[PDB]
Write a protein that holds these residues in place. Structure first.
Motif, PDB file in Angstrom:
ATOM      1  N   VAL A 361      13.964 -12.721   5.329  1.00  0.00           N
ATOM      2  CA  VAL A 361      13.263 -12.166   6.485  1.00  0.00           C
ATOM      3  C   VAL A 361      13.645 -12.906   7.763  1.00  0.00           C
ATOM      4  CG1 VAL A 361      11.167 -13.584   6.467  1.00  0.00           C
ATOM      5  CG2 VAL A 361      11.029 -11.156   7.116  1.00  0.00           C
ATOM      6  N   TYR A 362      14.223 -14.101   7.637  1.00  0.00           N
ATOM      7  CA  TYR A 362      14.609 -14.853   8.825  1.00  0.00           C
ATOM      8  C   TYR A 362      15.785 -14.200   9.542  1.00  0.00           C
ATOM      9  CZ  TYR A 362      11.448 -18.636   7.596  1.00  0.00           C
ATOM     10  OH  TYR A 362      10.333 -19.391   7.323  1.00  0.00           O
ATOM     11  N   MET A 363      16.629 -13.473   8.809  1.00  0.00           N
ATOM     12  CA  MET A 363      17.734 -12.767   9.448  1.00  0.00           C
ATOM     13  C   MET A 363      17.351 -11.355   9.881  1.00  0.00           C
ATOM     14  SD  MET A 363      18.402 -15.389   7.615  1.00  0.00           S
ATOM     15  CE  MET A 363      18.358 -15.047   5.865  1.00  0.00           C
ATOM     16  N   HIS A 364      16.846 -10.523   8.965  1.00  0.00           N
ATOM     17  CA  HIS A 364      16.632  -9.126   9.337  1.00  0.00           C
ATOM     18  C   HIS A 364      15.372  -8.950  10.178  1.00  0.00           C
ATOM     19  CE1 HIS A 364      13.545  -8.741   6.233  1.00  0.00           C
ATOM     20  NE2 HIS A 364      14.409  -9.096   5.300  1.00  0.00           N
ATOM     21  N   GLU A 365      14.436  -9.906  10.097  1.00  0.00           N
ATOM     22  CA  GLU A 365      13.259  -9.985  10.975  1.00  0.00           C
ATOM     23  C   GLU A 365      12.396  -8.727  10.899  1.00  0.00           C
ATOM     24  OE1 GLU A 365      14.398 -11.547  14.937  1.00  0.00           O
ATOM     25  OE2 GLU A 365      14.086 -13.450  13.889  1.00  0.00           O
ATOM     26  N   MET A 366      12.241  -8.195   9.695  1.00  0.00           N
ATOM     27  CA  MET A 366      11.528  -6.943   9.500  1.00  0.00           C
ATOM     28  C   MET A 366      10.119  -7.235   9.006  1.00  0.00           C
ATOM     29  SD  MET A 366      12.503  -3.995   6.711  1.00  0.00           S
ATOM     30  CE  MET A 366      14.149  -4.260   7.353  1.00  0.00           C
ATOM     31  N   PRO A 367       9.078  -6.725   9.666  1.00  0.00           N
ATOM     32  CA  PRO A 367       7.709  -6.974   9.195  1.00  0.00           C
ATOM     33  C   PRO A 367       7.451  -6.313   7.847  1.00  0.00           C
ATOM     34  CG  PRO A 367       7.714  -5.536  11.129  1.00  0.00           C
ATOM     35  CD  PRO A 367       9.125  -5.949  10.914  1.00  0.00           C
ATOM     36  N   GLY A 368       6.520  -6.901   7.089  1.00  0.00           N
ATOM     37  CA  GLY A 368       6.340  -6.507   5.699  1.00  0.00           C
ATOM     38  C   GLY A 368       5.806  -5.098   5.527  1.00  0.00           C
ATOM     39  N   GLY A 369       4.881  -4.688   6.398  1.00  0.00           N
ATOM     40  CA  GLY A 369       4.418  -3.310   6.364  1.00  0.00           C
ATOM     41  C   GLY A 369       5.537  -2.332   6.658  1.00  0.00           C
ATOM     42  N   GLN A 370       6.329  -2.623   7.683  1.00  0.00           N
ATOM     43  CA  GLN A 370       7.544  -1.877   7.964  1.00  0.00           C
ATOM     44  C   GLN A 370       8.568  -1.998   6.848  1.00  0.00           C
ATOM     45  OE1 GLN A 370      10.848  -1.611   9.256  1.00  0.00           O
ATOM     46  NE2 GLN A 370      10.472   0.396  10.184  1.00  0.00           N
ATOM     47  N   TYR A 371       8.583  -3.115   6.119  1.00  0.00           N
ATOM     48  CA  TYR A 371       9.479  -3.269   4.978  1.00  0.00           C
ATOM     49  C   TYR A 371       9.128  -2.295   3.859  1.00  0.00           C
ATOM     50  CZ  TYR A 371      12.058  -5.682   1.240  1.00  0.00           C
ATOM     51  OH  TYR A 371      12.907  -5.993   0.205  1.00  0.00           O
ATOM     52  N   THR A 372       7.852  -2.251   3.477  1.00  0.00           N
ATOM     53  CA  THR A 372       7.411  -1.325   2.438  1.00  0.00           C
ATOM     54  C   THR A 372       7.582   0.121   2.880  1.00  0.00           C
ATOM     55  OG1 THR A 372       5.127  -1.360   3.220  1.00  0.00           O
ATOM     56  CG2 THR A 372       5.781  -3.033   1.613  1.00  0.00           C
ATOM     57  N   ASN A 373       7.258   0.415   4.144  1.00  0.00           N
ATOM     58  CA  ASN A 373       7.416   1.775   4.647  1.00  0.00           C
ATOM     59  C   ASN A 373       8.883   2.182   4.695  1.00  0.00           C
ATOM     60  OD1 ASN A 373       4.622   2.306   5.069  1.00  0.00           O
ATOM     61  ND2 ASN A 373       4.695   1.089   6.954  1.00  0.00           N
ATOM     62  N   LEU A 374       9.767   1.252   5.061  1.00  0.00           N
ATOM     63  CA  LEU A 374      11.194   1.541   5.095  1.00  0.00           C
ATOM     64  C   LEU A 374      11.738   1.773   3.693  1.00  0.00           C
ATOM     65  CD1 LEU A 374      13.734   1.965   6.556  1.00  0.00           C
ATOM     66  CD2 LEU A 374      13.715  -0.399   7.338  1.00  0.00           C
ATOM     67  N   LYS A 375      11.272   0.986   2.719  1.00  0.00           N
ATOM     68  CA  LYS A 375      11.682   1.203   1.334  1.00  0.00           C
ATOM     69  C   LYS A 375      11.213   2.559   0.825  1.00  0.00           C
ATOM     70  CE  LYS A 375      12.838  -2.173  -2.150  1.00  0.00           C
ATOM     71  NZ  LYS A 375      12.536  -3.561  -2.593  1.00  0.00           N
ATOM     72  N   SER A 376       9.970   2.932   1.142  1.00  0.00           N
ATOM     73  CA  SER A 376       9.454   4.232   0.728  1.00  0.00           C
ATOM     74  C   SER A 376      10.209   5.375   1.400  1.00  0.00           C
ATOM     75  CB  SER A 376       7.960   4.322   1.035  1.00  0.00           C
ATOM     76  OG  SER A 376       7.739   4.895   2.310  1.00  0.00           O
ATOM     77  N   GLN A 377      10.559   5.208   2.678  1.00  0.00           N
ATOM     78  CA  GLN A 377      11.301   6.246   3.388  1.00  0.00           C
ATOM     79  C   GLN A 377      12.719   6.377   2.853  1.00  0.00           C
ATOM     80  OE1 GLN A 377      10.702   5.281   7.683  1.00  0.00           O
ATOM     81  NE2 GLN A 377       8.655   4.756   6.923  1.00  0.00           N
ATOM     82  N   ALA A 378      13.341   5.256   2.484  1.00  0.00           N
ATOM     83  CA  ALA A 378      14.666   5.310   1.874  1.00  0.00           C
ATOM     84  C   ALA A 378      14.609   5.970   0.505  1.00  0.00           C
ATOM     85  CB  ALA A 378      15.256   3.906   1.771  1.00  0.00           C
ATOM     86  N   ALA A 379      13.531   5.728  -0.243  1.00  0.00           N
ATOM     87  CA  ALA A 379      13.356   6.401  -1.525  1.00  0.00           C
ATOM     88  C   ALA A 379      13.129   7.897  -1.338  1.00  0.00           C
ATOM     89  CB  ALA A 379      12.192   5.774  -2.290  1.00  0.00           C
ATOM     90  N   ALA A 380      12.419   8.281  -0.274  1.00  0.00           N
ATOM     91  CA  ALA A 380      12.140   9.693  -0.031  1.00  0.00           C
ATOM     92  C   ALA A 380      13.400  10.455   0.356  1.00  0.00           C
ATOM     93  CB  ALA A 380      11.073   9.838   1.053  1.00  0.00           C
ATOM     94  N   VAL A 381      14.302   9.814   1.108  1.00  0.00           N
ATOM     95  CA  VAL A 381      15.554  10.450   1.499  1.00  0.00           C
ATOM     96  C   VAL A 381      16.662  10.177   0.487  1.00  0.00           C
ATOM     97  CG1 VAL A 381      16.395   8.530   2.919  1.00  0.00           C
ATOM     98  CG2 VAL A 381      16.922  10.925   3.624  1.00  0.00           C
ATOM     99  N   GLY A 382      16.383   9.394  -0.552  1.00  0.00           N
ATOM    100  CA  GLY A 382      17.392   9.095  -1.545  1.00  0.00           C
ATOM    101  C   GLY A 382      18.323   7.965  -1.177  1.00  0.00           C
ATOM    102  N   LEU A 383      17.950   7.145  -0.200  1.00  0.00           N
ATOM    103  CA  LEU A 383      18.760   6.021   0.242  1.00  0.00           C
ATOM    104  C   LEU A 383      18.248   4.690  -0.290  1.00  0.00           C
ATOM    105  CD1 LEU A 383      20.091   5.712   3.881  1.00  0.00           C
ATOM    106  CD2 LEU A 383      21.298   5.644   1.700  1.00  0.00           C
TER     107      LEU A 383
END
Ligand SMILES: [Mg+2]
Ligand SMILES: [Mn+2]
Length: 541
Positions: A361-383
């Motif tokens: 997280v020190y490099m990509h600097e992504m907040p954890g709520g946004q991390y889970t939401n981004l993972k779910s969105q990537a799963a929804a689009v197949g990414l």
């Protein structure tokens, strides 16, 4: 009312809960009620009610110990359980938190994603949750997260709407308003801070921390930038300065240096909020404690760690014999944590998964709520297979945008940009070359239009001209350009839509979330008050 609950129970029993896998209603024992040793104490809520906010600030300043704010009711379950914690589980322990922990500075129970998520998924009013918690916990301070000029919404609203929401929230029981701007822009926070001061509550001006102050390679968010921001925030008359470490980026040495330098510049009490995603939240809080921080943000141990806040019990034991102690009843805290573990067993379909200290997280600097939401969105689009490349595109897109502060909704812009960038397989040079031809995501275009405010140092000019092909770009507060909202007309239209005369809270909720509130009202008509159901029955029937 019985027919509505029967309809909901039949619907969940047959068709299952929407968005989760169908399972049997596995048997659960009753959650363990705590055994508390009650001691009467005068809390900060009593001080605020009797002598006002300035007396609360003086009480914080004269407190040698470091105070604790419980984020169990908002941010712990926002990070861990996808904000799905229901009021029915909260109300079994609300009185126990009010009585067994009077040393808490405040309890963060509102704002952030709770307001939208309750209406959208839990089918319960956040106003109703606020009212029930205020009745259950009378001697504790209620803290809410306020997104500057966006309040609880994800877009800009006119100033009268923000003032009315602040007034209604203060009347319904919110005592501390943590006001942050997504890009650390002061004009988006000035009017909200003034409205909170006018309503008589505590105004927590907030600085979102990003980058590393001890890293000379990244000089934009240096210590001087935060010192100037703290000075101009103190000029606005805010009661407490807040430091929001959204992604766990604040390192312990950096925490000590930052809190010491902010203590030198301003005389405001400092509230530190961090996440344990890097695994260094406890030692960061300890280093800030040696620097002289006043209030820190902790969660119960059963809902702590990972993307959530550090545990309050471990924060007590880490500071037990040091020069500064935490203000908590640790035995009562563990007794409450037993209940929290037992009710966390209810939310198994919303669990993130196996959690570890995550130093990436020190490099990509992504907040954890946004991390889970981004993972779910990537799963929804197949990414979701290439989420490492999603992380790399997130970091590179953040650097392309000019190293912006990545907190909601600005982190959502970067996430959408990275998802779109991996969606059609191009690079940043391809963005600069072909970017006129493609259609960028709406959030990125809205951000480059200035609807999120002005970032530090301004936009990259050529990239901005690529992103907005012909759209108009404002350079001021978006609230000045917002459409005028008249509350009597909105109330009349809402009465037409929902069939009864609505209160001020319902009107201000309809303004912020028009479709979500109407869908909530339709669900209330169809199923009734499903917040009264216990959580396994609510999820499985
Ligand atoms: Mg103090
Ligand atoms: Mn947080």
């Amino acid at each position: 009312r019985g027919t509505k609950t029967l309809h909901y129970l039949s619907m969940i029993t047959v068709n299952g809960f929407p968005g989760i896998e169908n399972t049997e209603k596995r048997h659960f024992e009753e959650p363990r009620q705590p055994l508390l040793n009650l001691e009467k104490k005068k809390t900060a809520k009593n001080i605020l009610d009797e002598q006002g906010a300035d007396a609360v600030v003086d009480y914080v300043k004269n407190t040698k110990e470091v105070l604790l704010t419980d984020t169990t009711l908002r941010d712990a379950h926002q990070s861990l359980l996808a904000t799905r914690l229901r009021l029915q589980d909260m109300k079994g322990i609300a009185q126990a938190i009010d009585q067994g922990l009077p040393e808490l500075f405040s309890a963060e129970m509102w704002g952030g994603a709770t307001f939208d998520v309750a209406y959208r998924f839990l089918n319960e009013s956040p106003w109703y949750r606020l009212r029930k918690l205020r009745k259950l916990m009378p001697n504790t301070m209620f803290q809410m997260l306020f997104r500057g000029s966006n309040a609880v919404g994800y877009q800009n609203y006119p100033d009268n709407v923000i003032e009315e929401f602040i007034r209604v929230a203060a009347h319904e029981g919110i005592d501390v308003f943590r006001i942050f701007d997504s890009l650390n822009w002061l004009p988006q926070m000035e009017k909200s801070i003034q409205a909170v001061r006018d309503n008589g509550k505590i105004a927590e001006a907030t600085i979102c921390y990003t980058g590393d102050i001890l890293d000379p390679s990244r000089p934009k968010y240096n210590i001087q930038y935060y010192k100037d921001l703290a000075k101009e925030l103190e000029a606005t008359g805010a009661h407490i300065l807040a430091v929001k470490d959204m992604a766990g980026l604040l390192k312990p040495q950096a925490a000590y240096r930052l809190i010491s330098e902010l203590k030198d510049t301003v005389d405001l009490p400092i509230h530190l909020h961090t996440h344990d995603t890097s695994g260094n939240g406890i030692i960061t809080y300890s280093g800030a404690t040696q620097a002289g921080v006043d209030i820190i943000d902790v969660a119960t141990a059963s809902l702590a760690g990972g993307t959530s806040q550090p545990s309050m019990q471990s924060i007590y034991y880490a500071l037990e014999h040091g020069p500064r102690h935490a203000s908590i009843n640790v035995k009562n805290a563990e007794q409450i944590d037993h209940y929290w573990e037992d009710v966390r067993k209810y939310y198994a379909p919303f669990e993130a998964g196996i959690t570890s200290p995550q130093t990436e997280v020190y490099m990509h600097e992504m907040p954890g709520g946004q991390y889970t939401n981004l993972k779910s969105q990537a799963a929804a689009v197949g990414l979701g297979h290439r989420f490492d490349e999603i992380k790399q595109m997130y970091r590179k897109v953040n650097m392309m945008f000019g190293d912006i502060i990545k907190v909601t909704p600005s982190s959502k812009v970067v996430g959408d940009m990275a998802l779109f960038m991996i969606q059609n397989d191009l690079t940043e040079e391809d963005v600069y070359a072909r970017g006129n031809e493609l259609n960028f995501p709406e959030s990125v275009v809205s951000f480059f239009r200035g609807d999120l405010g002005q970032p530090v140092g301004g936009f990259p000019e050529k990239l901005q001209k690529i992103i907005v092909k012909d759209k108009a770009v404002i350079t001021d507060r978006p609230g000045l350009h917002a459409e005028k909202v008249d509350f009597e007309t909105v109330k009349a239209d809402l009465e037409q839509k929902i069939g009864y005369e609505p209160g001020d809270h319902e009107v201000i909720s309809y303004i912020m979330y028009p479709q979500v509130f109407l869908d909530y009202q339709k669900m209330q008509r169809e199923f009734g008050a499903v917040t009264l159901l216990d959580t396994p029955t609510f999820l499985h029937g």
